[PDB]
Structures are given as C-alpha cells and as structure tokens.
Design a protein around this ligand. Structure first.
Ligand SMILES: [Zn+2]
Lengths: 127, 87
C-alpha cells in the first residue's frame, strides 16, 4: 500500500498497563523499548511495519505478560491484538496504528514518534 | 465445521473443540474465518462479556479452554439457562 522507509523515533515510556488503562489520554504511544528495536530498519510498506511492530511487542517479556494467551498468539504472527467488546466499532475489532501527522502534511510514515495505538471507537472518533 | 446453533447441542468436549478451532484461526493470516466463529461463540453462549471471555479472561479463573467453559457453565446455570448437552 505504502512506500518503503526506515523507522525512526524515541518511543515513549510505558508501565505494565500499556493499553488497558492509560496515564494520559485514550491513545497509547510506542513503548520506547519497542522503538529501540525497530529504529533504523527498512520496511517495504507501513503494513510491513505494523506487522513487525506487534511481533516485537510479543517478544518483550514485560508488555506481553499483560495480554491473554490468545491475544499473545495473535501478535506473534503479526496481527493486532483484539480489543474489548466495548472498544469495537463495526467489523474493526483489533487495535489500530494511528498517525499524528497525516502522511499528507509532513508525512512521517515510520516516525515512531508520530504513531499511536488506538481503539476503533477512538480512531473513528478522532477523525 | 459442524456448527450447532445452540449451546445444548454441544457437549463440553465438543465446545472445547470449537475453542481450539478459534485458537487455530487466531494465528491464521487473516481474521476472515476467525471473526465468523467468534460471532457464533458470542451468539450460542449469550454471555454479555462476548469475546472478552477468550481475549480478556477474568483473573478469577484459568486462561484456558477449560477456564472458559467453566465461566460459561457457571453463568448459564446461575441465570437459569440450558447447559451443554449431556452425552
Ligand atoms: Zn488515523
């Protein structure tokens, strides 16, 4: 879908409730521990990125422990974890990767500091 | 597969089989078949938690197909709803 590139960003620090409850808003950042693994790497398309983003998320012993066994299996193959029934909208039932600065204005497709994880209800809302 | 339209057509061993099918479709390339079985599990169990029973298990039970079955039995019996087939 998109064009290749190298992931960049510092990521942000998160606790052991990364997605569940947030200390800030209804949007969760790219764990700095994760950003450190995808930094300076090229991905054929942003989907290739999200695919690997979730993979690493399942390799981290601290964040994975916060997901069920089923949600863990999903991320291991590169799929976004399922949300809770109350955060689902339509057929979208998985966590989504949003872009702070549209690929339009200043792009920044792999700018890990430009990407935040959100729920459909939210993404659809913040649109 | 052999999808029954009621929880009482399912024996416990059979419902546990449907949970492994879901787990299997859980790691497949797409969520096409998985999302279909999940809508069925949701409709035959009638639990208000929905898919959460699979992806967001209650800390008061095991995160396993047995733990899932238990919660459905308990909630169904406690609400006066027919259970799993006997045979
Ligand atoms: Zn967006």
């Amino acid at each position: 879908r998109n064009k290749p590139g190298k992931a960049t960003g510092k990521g942000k620090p998160v606790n052991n409730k990364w997605l569940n409850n947030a200390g800030k808003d209804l949007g969760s950042p790219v764990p700095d521990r994760i950003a450190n693994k995808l930094r300076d790497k090229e991905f054929k398309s942003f989907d290739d990125f999200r695919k690997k983003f979730w993979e690493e998320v399942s390799k981290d012993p601290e964040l994975s422990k916060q997901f069920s066994r089923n949600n863990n299996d999903r991320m291991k193959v590169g799929k976004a974890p399922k949300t809770r029934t109350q955060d689902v909208s339509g057929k979208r039932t998985s966590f989504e990767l949003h872009h702070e600065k549209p690929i339009s204005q200043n792009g920044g497709v792999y700018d890990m500091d430009n990407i935040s994880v959100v729920t459909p209800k939210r993404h659809i809302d913040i649109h | 597969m052999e999808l029954k339209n009621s929880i009482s057509d399912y024996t416990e061993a059979e419902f546990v089989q449907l949970l492994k099918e879901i787990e299997k479709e859980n790691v497949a390339a797409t969520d096409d078949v998985l999302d279909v079985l999940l809508e069925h599990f949701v409709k035959i169990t009638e639990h208000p938690d929905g898919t959460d029973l699979i992806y967001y298990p209650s800390d008061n039970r095991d995160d396993s197909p047995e733990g899932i079955v238990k919660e459905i039995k308990e909630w169904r019996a406690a609400n006066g709803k027919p259970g799993f087939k006997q045979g």
